[PDB]
Amino acid sequence: DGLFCARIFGPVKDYECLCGKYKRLKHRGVICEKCGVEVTQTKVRRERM
Amino acid sequence: TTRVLTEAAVAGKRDELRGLKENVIVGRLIPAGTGYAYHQDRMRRRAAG
Amino acid sequence: RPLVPLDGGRFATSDLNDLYRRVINRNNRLKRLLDLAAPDIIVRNEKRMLQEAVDALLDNGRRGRAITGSNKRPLKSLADMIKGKQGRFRQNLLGKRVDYSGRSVITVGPYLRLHQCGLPKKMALELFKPFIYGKLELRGLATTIKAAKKMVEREEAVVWDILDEVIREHPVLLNRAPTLHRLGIQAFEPVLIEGKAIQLHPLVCAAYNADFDGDQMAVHVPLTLEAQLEARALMMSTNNILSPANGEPIIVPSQDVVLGLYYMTRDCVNAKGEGMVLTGPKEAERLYRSGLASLHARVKVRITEYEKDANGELVAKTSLKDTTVGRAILWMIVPKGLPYSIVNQALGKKAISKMLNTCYRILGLKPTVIFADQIMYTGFAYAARSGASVGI
Amino acid sequence: KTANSGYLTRRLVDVAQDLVVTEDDCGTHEGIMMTPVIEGGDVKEPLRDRVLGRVTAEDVLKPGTADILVPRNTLLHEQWCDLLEENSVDAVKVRSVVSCDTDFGVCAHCYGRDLARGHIINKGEAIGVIAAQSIGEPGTQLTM
Amino acid sequence: MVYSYTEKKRIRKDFGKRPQVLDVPYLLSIQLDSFQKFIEQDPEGQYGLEAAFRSVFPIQSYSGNSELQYVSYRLGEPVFDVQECQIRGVTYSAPLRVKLRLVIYEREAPEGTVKDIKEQEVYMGEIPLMTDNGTFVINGTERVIVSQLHRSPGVFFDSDKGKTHSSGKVLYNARIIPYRGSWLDFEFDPKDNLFVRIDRRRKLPATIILRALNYTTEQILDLFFEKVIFEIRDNKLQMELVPERLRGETASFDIEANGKVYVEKGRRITARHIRQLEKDDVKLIEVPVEYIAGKVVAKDYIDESTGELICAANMELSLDLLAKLSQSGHKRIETLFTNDLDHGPYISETLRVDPTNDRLSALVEIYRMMRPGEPPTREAAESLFENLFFSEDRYDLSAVGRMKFNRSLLREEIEGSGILSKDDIIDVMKKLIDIRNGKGEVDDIDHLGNRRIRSVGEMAENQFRVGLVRVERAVKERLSLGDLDTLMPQDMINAKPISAAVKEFFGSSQLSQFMDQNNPLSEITHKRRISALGPGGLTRERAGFEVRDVHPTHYGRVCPIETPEGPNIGLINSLSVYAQTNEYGFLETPYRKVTDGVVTDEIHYLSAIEEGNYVIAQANSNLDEEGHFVEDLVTCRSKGESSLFSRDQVDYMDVSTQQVVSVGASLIPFLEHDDANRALMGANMQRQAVPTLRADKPLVGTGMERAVAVDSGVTAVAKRGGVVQYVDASRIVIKVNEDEMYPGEAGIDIYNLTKYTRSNQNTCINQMPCVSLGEPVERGDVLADGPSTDLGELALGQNMRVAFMPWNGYNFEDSILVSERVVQEDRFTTIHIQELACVSRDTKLGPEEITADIPNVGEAALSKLDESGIVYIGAEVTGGDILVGKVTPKGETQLTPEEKLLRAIFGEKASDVKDSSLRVPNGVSGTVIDVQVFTRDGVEKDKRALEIEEMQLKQAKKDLSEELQILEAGLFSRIRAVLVAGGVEAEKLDKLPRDRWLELGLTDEEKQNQLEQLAEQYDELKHEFEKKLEAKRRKITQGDDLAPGVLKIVKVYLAVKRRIQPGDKMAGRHGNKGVISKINPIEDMPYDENGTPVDIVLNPLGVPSRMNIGQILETHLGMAAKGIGDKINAMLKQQQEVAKLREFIQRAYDLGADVRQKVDLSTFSDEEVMRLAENLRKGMPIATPVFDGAKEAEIKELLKLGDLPTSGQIRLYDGRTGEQFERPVTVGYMYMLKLNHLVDDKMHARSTGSYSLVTQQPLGGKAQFGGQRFGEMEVWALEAYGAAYTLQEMLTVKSDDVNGRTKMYKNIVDGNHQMEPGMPESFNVLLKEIRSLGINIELED
DNA sequence: ATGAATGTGCAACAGCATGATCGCGGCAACGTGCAAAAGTCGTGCCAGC
RNA sequence: GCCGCGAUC
Ligand SMILES: [Mg+2]
Ligand SMILES: [Zn+2]
Ligand SMILES: [Zn+2]
């Protein structure tokens, strides 16, 4: 829950979510149970406020 | 810019992108020269609905 | 607002991040001090501190002193970084750095036409790399893009030939650093040279306000069909001859050209050839190049003029006039339709400008461009032949 | 002084950027008296330089009364100016952009022929930026 | 005797015409002298570290009976020499050791001590040293420090130009600028009110501080005004008579003197009436009552009847008040002057403005005004006032500040306390009142007597003082809780703050920059640089037109020519040739004393202030044989202006014509014929020429080349050399002549020349010897000439046969047309050494070993690597070839079966390790030179490391063996003489070694004394050789203590030869520059009758408009010199007799017009005449001094001596058509320099490189594959053209369209040329930024 | 003759002062103890050679 | 992501 986090602002490294639970393109717009990071194209770090 | 924004913020005004400076900032065709004809066609479509 | 990286995995907190983190640091402690039933003075002070921190984050340098970071410099807030100079100067509003652009020192090329600039073959093959990829793939020399990349780096001879094929009629526009007026960025037709500096036509130096003592110019490539037409029909050097400020021709010969024209059109009291009568301007060149006559001698030459009183028609009149050998030689480059009283002078940097202005007004644009090129060629040649030198 | 001239050019360009020739002729009868500029006893600007490349708002009358010389709303050029200078004309009333009378732009006639090309100015040219650049191009050489 | 050996090699034909009195000083004296006075021990505390130690130490606790007593200090020996320190990459410094002891005082017995621990030295801090050239080698760099020219502390009066309120009221203000502490100002209102701006707070009355100095209302009025007494006895009301007071006034009533009318009512006011009244001795007389109404009472009379009194000072009087004072018995009433003719009403008005009349009230007022926080409690305000001013430590006027304070106030004493007293504020207030009244004048702010100069020593002293204050504050806490067992190092000696501050100053400061290394001239002119910027200086934007102007006192102290051009003009200066600094820090200039009409040779040094009183003559004024001036009227400079004065009124004489100019402008021949701005440009351009392959002397110079080259430290000067013994391409050894030796151990002087070595500007530094073998060498002789130096002569260019003529437009504007023989003869070819570095450092997963074996790299790239993994020395490299083979370990602990089979089929690592191998950057070619592997201690040394150490040992032993050879030779000679003295065996003794067993014993005395002493000397000399050989073997080969993260480092140098080419910039030394335009073949250059084609063709059109007459005169003079050289060369071609050659050289040396050149070949032997003639066969290198040199007549005579056209122009034939050019063309030899602006470093071209995360725009600048920035003006021009599609494609698809870039790249590769534009990322970033504020911006549909 | 409203003048605070290139260095802000879970290590297991 | 310093037009 810092200034640069993963639950909001989108992911950090490509289509890979935190903890490696869901890191693929088979999953789109899913929320991992352990971590709230959503899968996206990591270009959404420029839009989420 | 601090003065202009607030006097524009409280009034809730619009830009409408009529001059050349506004269109250069956005990156569209300026209403002059070769780009003037393109802005003439667009005006009729907006007025006609 | 990414962190600034440094040696090792340590990531330094930037200016913007510090301003935020102070705000949350105050906010957590305040929202805690609310529920502890703290005395009014302490929560009052914390509220003032949080309010000041928020104000400093939103605009540093207002309502008191300016907070500072590691160095004794203000920490720029959201206000100071809107885009560049608190406005939109650097990163927006005509401040975009563009690719497909080069930069090198400029020298003089007198063999060039009015619409040509010498472009090094090393800047080309880099500005026109995607065009080269397209032409390589079109002709089947490289089936895959990777092969085209590898062979462009290896710079085989066929790559040079394909670059010459691509360049043929793709206008490129050069500009100087302080673009004062609209003539400070003009589009030329590149000619590849085995060299390392841009060769600029001497006539356009007055428009560019550029002199060859270390001056550099940028080379921007218009890479679209609309852009190429705009750079050909609106920005070509042969297109804008009259300056858009007073109507006088900005592209006018100066320096060595003017000196050569002045030396050619002068009269000496006594020289090789006095009172000679010769058939026309053709004989004036033969007599001078043979050494039998001097450029400043006074003779009588039978010369033909062309006149435009008739509606769209040229009438030819022939008469015997008293002039010099140099003026007779110079007359051979002027186009049809100009009276002879326009070269029977000294041509001192003003009569030549009026010569070009009258040629433009009466004849048009193509004749005046050809006339300007011929004038500069002959002025350079005869200034060099004169051997004018400054001594003590 | 180059900085103080560049700032002036910046301000002029910002003010004049929104100016494009969007009309052909507003039809207004307004004009501006253009007499040769004189200072004391020396001729310092002839009428030919001031009125060249402009449109006549009203017909110029020769000293002989009831004698028309040029039609109203016509462009003056080398032939017209040479004919006009042969006579003894002193004042010519010509239309200018201050009285274009059009909205959001300037009529192609009220603004005279462009100085870059011989013909009259075509629609769409950004005359404001050209004017600002022309005014601010000198200034780096003005003696202050 | 008249000429030295190196001068005998080539004598410059000086044109002189004016004898020199004082020779040029060391020319680098400011830096070396400042650092010497910063480091050298001083018995007193004048300056240096000792002064700072006395200022801070001793220290003691707060009544803790413990004090810190110190004695002396010492600086240790540096652990690396300059060369090794430069190569390794660390700061050249020395340890700092200080002697100080601990004393413990008795608590029970006052003023008694119980313990005294005299501890030894404690190490504290690193102080970098200055190299003998004047550079501070820090972090493996040069880092010269420029002196600062800042405002001198003192008292400065100003008038503010008289235009603040636009009312025409000139406002006088005073400032008290200290060396350290708070400021203090006095300011005059439009309403004539005294305002004091303390530390630049709000304007405050001066009366508050005046009362805070314990001054009462009556006392301040008495001190600041002249009071008068009005006596009213028996209703007469008499008035005192002071004739000098009343000058302009109106007689409101008849004035009678002793009952006789003297001045009538409204009578004459002329000085005659005043003189008549003064002549008559008249006592007090009565005056009208209404006259006293306007007067103001100063004192406060007390009524004797009751305690009530009229104590209202600075107030008028009432009619009823007269009755009250008469009843009280006030016979005499004291009132101030109240006169306004020259004086005015002040002070009293300010006392009426503010009512605080108490010291405590004033203190609390000023404390509240300066500090708006907590109010004081009778202690805070007093402490704040004590700390602000009249404090020993917090505020401190410098000694020079005190001197200027006393001089500005005209005080006899020049010394005093460095603190301001109560009388001082009164004095400055009085002087401000006087300057307002009319007396006195305002001083100029740009006066060089008011602008102090400070050097590296003073700045380093200030930084050390700050560090000392910090460590003292840290130490003071120890003694409070310190026990007797606490030793000095255990008492937080705390060297860290001092070292941190010193290194911060030396490494990162406004006035410690990278030194320029192109030519010795750039180094010389950078070391003696005057900078007005810096910490205590002024901002570039802050400087007005007045500062950037040439004040008339910049005559002999600051150069008026040499200065940067665009931004920094007038803010960066250069010291003149003869200028130095005062004992306080003011610039002086030499002058010659003139007594009666004859100028003596005695030299007096005058500061800026002193020279404004005398009358100073001109250097270019004629003299007589005895010394009198040749005219009765002589031009002079009296006080800033110049006029003509009588021969008997002359007081001082200029030493030489070079006095005004600096070093950089002194090397321009015919400087007086050049325009001032063009001379500025030429002087600035000289400091940029790159040293070429071969040094080439200037055919025409100013004789100052030798002084520039010798004192720059670039050359190798024989310190005490005699006759050279062995000359090598890298070493020179000289056997010193016997007349001067150091007794004991004998010895020879050995020089280790520095071969090809990278400079700061990537240029190469080379040293080539001059002497051949057995050549005698005197003191100060130059043996090895560095870059751009020929026989000790600064030579930073090459002479070129320049012809001034336009050549088919190829020399248009400022373009230069160059022949191809220039390229073929390898002129202007320069060496550029570039540094590429690689460091092997450990990481998380293991060590980063370096080896040749690099996975996934073919055998093609391994061709040029050794068994260690770095390229062979001498391998020619280009493109992107691998240089060092370095591997970075990767993390993997899960051996999956795929990885198992990978390790089974491939090597054990299976290419797990990465390859972080340094590659040659793009555009860099050239053969490698050196590799500089260094190893951390403990780790196994590299295979090639042993060869480096073995080479070092080889050179070490070879260098030490020569002195040992000489010493044992002397011992053998002594033993041979002893054995010849008795029992000589002739050659038999010499045949047997060890002196044939020491010749047995022979006589008893010889065996006991001679042979025994010889054996003892041999034994101890052998042992002394062995011990130092062992120590120097040990210290050279040691494990370096690298950085803790760094394990092992490797550095690779490249060497690239840059041949001259069209784009490269070339310039002369007269302000003419240009870029080449074409390398024409030899057969196209114009040729004279004999067929010699010119080398450079210039444009005549550049002379008449730039007023570079130095070009034409230099070309004519060089043509004459080359004609003389050609005559001598042809004469040597026919090998004629020595007598004829000597006669010709003699007749060509004494030519001129009363030149001060008395060289003669009669005292020259045969062999040196031939050597001289073979040395000047290329051309007679003449020298014309700066402002008094060769005239046109002398140049014409020199040309006529060589059988050349007098007018200086020859008939030039065209190279192509062979047709004679109609006019003659001026052909001459001009000295052309090749500047450091090469196109090879100035071309860029980008199509798609690397963008930035924010704004997604391409990067900027070369070495980053950036793109040229499309500025605002360019877009304005695009709009003016009407070109809109170009604007759109240059605004979106080239810069900020993330998808647009890729789409349009694909379209071009396909061949579509379709726009398909979009929305720039920059505007989205701006929208997000604005939305991050409280303002909402959205895009409507 | 005096009070109040108004207009004028003066002082403090805010924004702003050319464009494009090239080359070198130096460079910031914890703790706490237990549940609760999770990971880990010493140990015993069957399956392949 | 700059800050100083120097340089070119
Ligand atoms: Mg230039
Ligand atoms: Zn996850
Ligand atoms: Zn109109």
Author numbering:
A (entry chain D): 54 to 102
B (entry chain D): 1328 to 1376
C (entry chain D): 250 to 641
D (entry chain D): 789 to 932
E (entry chain C): 1 to 1341
What did the paper state?
Transcription initiation in bacteria involves the recruitment of RNAP by sigma factors (σ) to promoter regions located upstream from the transcription start site (TSS, position +1). In approximately 60% of bacteria, a major variant σ factor, σ54, forms a class of its own, lacking structural and sequence similarity to σ70. In σ54-mediated transcription initiation, σ54 recruits RNAP to genes responsible for regulating a variety of stress responses, including nutrient depletion, membrane stress, antibiotic exposure, and biofilm formation. In this study, we used single-particle cryo-electron microscopy (cryoEM) to determine the structures of initial transcribing complexes of increasing RNA lengths from 5 nt to 9 nt, which allow us to propose a mechanism of RNAP promoter escape in the σ54 system.
